[PDB]
Paper text:
Cohesin’s association with chromatin involves subunits recruited by Scc1: Wapl, Pds5, and Scc3/SA, in addition to Scc2/4 loading complex. Because all eukaryotic genomes encode orthologs, Scc3 is the most important of cohesin’s regulatory subunits.
To this end, we purified following expression in Escherichia coli a version of Saccharomyces cerevisiae (Sc) Scc3 lacking its unstructured N- and C-terminal extensions. However, this only yielded poorly diffracting crystals with a large unit cell. Despite many attempts, we were unable to obtain co-crystals suitable for structure determination, with S. cerevisiae or Z. rouxii proteins. Though S. cerevisiae Scc3 packed tightly as dimers in the crystals, those from Z. rouxii crystallized as monomers. These include (spontaneous) point mutations in Wapl, Smc3, Pds5, and Scc3. Thus, Scc3D189E and E202K are in juxtaposed α-helices at the N-terminus while R996S is situated in a loop closely juxtaposed to the penultimate α-helix containing R1043L.
Residue numbers in the entry:
A (entry chain A), B (entry chain B): 674 to 692, 698 to 710, 720 to 880, 889 to 1059
C-alpha cells in the first residue's frame, strides 16, 4: 500500500528532519499511480541533485535510504527501471570524476575536498542504491576507483581532517563483490558442467590488503591518530566481509563444480595477507582497549603490545564502541572458523574473555 | 531473501541491544524454510514471554516491530497464520485481564501497576501486530476496554506516576477503526451497488470525546501537570486521526453510494464535540508555548488567555517539541479543511505564525 508504506513515512521523515528537501516538504504542505509517479520523480530528482554526507552527520542519508528501500519492496516494474537508470548515471559521472579530478597526473592538491565530493556526490548514493539494487561496474571503472582513489589514500591522508576521514568507507566494494558472487552463484547452480571470472573480486581483495598494510606504516601523531585507526578499521572490516562472503559462496557450491573450485584456488593464492593479518589484530586490540576504558576494566596483555593502548585518546569515530567491538569480534570468529587466522591470533582474542561481560565471553 | 531481509537484521538488532532476549542471541552466537519457521517460533515465544514497554524506554518494542514487519512483507502463508494465532491469543487474554483485574467492582486499588500490565502484556503487542495485520475486536472486548479502562482513566489518574502516564496511548483504537474502514472500502470496491455498520467506530469516537472532556475537568497540580497534558494530547491525537480517517473514507465514496453516504450522517451526529474542541485548542496552546520557550519568543495571546501558558515546566514527555508542535498543527489544518473546526480556532492557530520560524508559517 503505497500511501501507508511509501508516501506517509517519507512525509514524516521530512517533517522531522526540517526541525534541497524543502521543495519536497513544501509540496506536501499544499494539495489536500499518476500521482505516485510524480512524487517519486520529485524525490528521485532531489536525491540525484543533493550532496549526501555520512549518516552520522547528514540526516538526508537515512531519509533517502528508507525511501529507496520502500520503493524497491513495492516491486513496481517502472520504478525498478527508474532506479536502475539512476545507478547507470551515477556510474557515468563517477567515471568522469575519477578520470579528471582524481587523475594522478593532476597538480591539484585538494585531497580533502575531492574525497568529500567523491563520497557526497557518488559513492554514498551508489552505496545506498546497492543495498537493494544490483550494482556492477566495468573493469575500467573499477580500476579507476582502485588506482585513482583507494591506492592513494595513504598519500592523500596528510591532507585529511577528521570529518573527511569519517566519510571514507568501503561498503560499495563489498556490495560490488557480493552482487558479483550472486551473479555467479546462479550461473554455476544452473550451468554446472574461465580465466578471469575472479578478476574484479581478486582486484578488490588485493587492493584492501595493500591499503591495510600501507596504513599501518603511516606515522601516528596526536592529530592523525583517531582518523588513522578509523580508516584501518574501515578497510579491515570491508576486507573481512568480502573474505567471509567468497568463503561462504564457495561452501555453497555443488559437489560437481570442481572446475569452479579449482579456478578460485588458482586465482586467490591468499585471501588475507599475513601482514594485513597483523593490522587486524592491532584493530581488535584498539577496540578492546576502548571498550575496556568504557567499562573500567583492566586488561591483560601479552608482553609486546603497543603502550599506546593503555591510554588511547578519546574518539568521536566510534559512538557505540561495545557494538563495534562485539561486531568486530564476531567477524574475527568467522575467519577463525574458516581457518584464515593463526591460532596465536585465536589465543589473544580469548585472553580477556573473563573480563568483558558475558556476551563477549560467549562469542569466544 | 529471508536471511538478508529477516534473519541478519534481527541478529544485528539483538547484538546492538545487548549492549529473555539472551536465549535468542545465544542461538545466533553458536550455529552457522524449516529453519525460518523455527526462528519465527523462537522469536514469537520471546515476544509472548516479554513485557514490552513504550518504545522510548524499551528497546524490545522496535526490535519486535521490525521483525514482525519483515515477516509480514515476506508474505509466506504459514508465517502469517502464526501471527494471526498470536493476535487471537492476545485478545482472549486481554478480555480476561479486563474482566478480572480491571472490573470496576473490584476492591483492588493499584491502577498504576494494572495499567502498566495492561500495556506491557497486551496493548503494546497488539498495537505492534496491528500495524501489518488486520486487528478486529468483538463488541464484548471493545466495550470491556472502553468501559473498564478508557472511561476510567480520569479516576485512575491520581494513582499514576510519569512513566505510567507515558505508557498510555490510543493507537490500537485508531488501528481498530482504520482496519474497519479498510474492510468496508474493499467490499464497496469489489462488490458495488447498513443499520449498525458504524457501531464500533462510533463507540470509540464517542468515548474519546468524553475522555478528552473529562481530562480537562481534572484538577491540575504542580506534580501531575506534565502527565496530564500528555494524556490529553494523546487522546486528542488519536481522536483527530480517527476523524480524519472516517472523513477521507466518506470523501472517497462513489456518488451513487447514497445508502452509504446516508448511513454516516445518520450514525455520526457529531465527530468532535464542542467541549472536546476546546481541549484541542488548549493542547495546541500548550505545544505552542513549549515550542516558544524552546526558541525564546514571546507569544501574542487572546485577551482572556490563560497566563499559566507563560510559565510552563519542562517536560520529558515531548523530547522533540518542534516536530510534535508541527505535527499537531498539520492535523489541525486537516480538520480545518474538512470543516470540523471553526474560524475562531483557525484565527488563534494563525496568531503567532510570523514568530515561530519558516515552517510553521508555511503550514499556516
Amino acid at each position: 500500500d503505497s500511501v501507508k508504506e511509501i508516501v506517509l513515512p517519507l512525509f514524516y521523515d521530512l517533517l522531522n528532519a526540517a526541525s534541497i528537501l524543502c521543495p519536497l516538504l513544501e509540496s506536501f504542505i499544499t494539495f489536500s499511480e499518476t500521482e505516485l509517479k510524480k512524487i517519486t520523480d520529485k524525490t528521485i530528482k532531489a536525491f540525484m541533485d543533493s550532496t549526501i554526507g555520512n549518516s552520522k552527520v547528514d540526516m538526508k542519508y537515512d531519509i533517502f535510504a528508507k525511501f529507496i528501500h520502500h520503493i524497491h519492496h513495492f516491486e513496481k516494474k517502472e520504478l525498478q527501471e527508474k532506479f536502475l537508470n539512476q545507478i547507470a548515471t551515477l556510474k557515468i559521472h563517477l567515471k568522469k570524476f575519477l578520470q579528471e579530478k582524481m587523475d594522478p597526473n593532476n597538480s591539484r592538491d585538494d585531497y580533502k575536498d575531492l574525497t568529500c565530493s567523491l563520497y557526497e556526490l557518488y559513492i554514498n548514493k551508489l552505496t545506498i542504491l546497492g543495498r537493494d539494487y544490483p550494482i556492477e561496474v566495468d573493469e575500467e571503472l573499477l580500476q579507476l576507483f582502485l588506482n585513482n582513489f583507494v591506492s592513494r589514500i595513504p598519500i592523500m591522508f596528510q591532507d585529511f581532517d577528521d570529518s573527511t576521514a569519517q566519510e571514507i568507507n568501503f561498503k560499495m566494494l563489498v556490495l560490488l563483490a557480493t552482487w558479483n558472487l550472486e551473479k555467479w552463484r546462479e550461473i554455476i547452480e544452473k550451468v554446472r558442467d574461465l580465466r578471469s571470472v575472479w578478476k574484479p573480486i581478486a582486484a578488490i581483495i588485493g587492493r584492501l590488503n595493500t591499503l591495510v598494510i600501507s596504513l599501518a606504516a603511516t606515522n601516528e601523531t596526536f592529530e592523525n591518530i583517531n582518523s588513522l585507526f578509523y580508516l584501518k578499521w574501515s578497510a579491515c572490516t570491508s576486507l573481512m566481509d568480502i573474505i567471509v562472503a567468497i568463503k561462504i559462496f564457495e561452501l555453497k557450491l555443488p559437489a560437481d563444480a570442481t572446475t569452479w573450485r579449482y579456478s578460485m584456488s588458482e586465482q586467490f593464492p591468499f585471501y588475507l595477507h599475513d601482514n594485513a593479518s597483523k593490522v587486524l589484530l592491532k584493530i581488535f586490540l584498539y577496540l578492546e582497549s576502548l571498550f575496556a576504558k568504557q567499562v573500567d576494566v583492566q586488561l591483560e596483555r601479552v608482553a609486546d603490545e603497543d603502550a599506546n593502548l593503555n591510554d588511547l585518546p578519546e574518539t568521536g569515530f566510534f559512538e557505540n564502541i561495545e557494538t563495534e567491538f562485539l561486531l568486530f569480534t564476531v567477524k574475527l570468529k568467522g575467519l577463525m572458523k574458516l581457518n584464515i587466522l593463526d591460532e596465536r591470533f585465536a589465543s589473544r582474542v580469548a585472553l580477556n574473555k573473563e573480563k568483558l561481560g558475558p556476551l563477549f565471553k560467549k562469542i569466544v
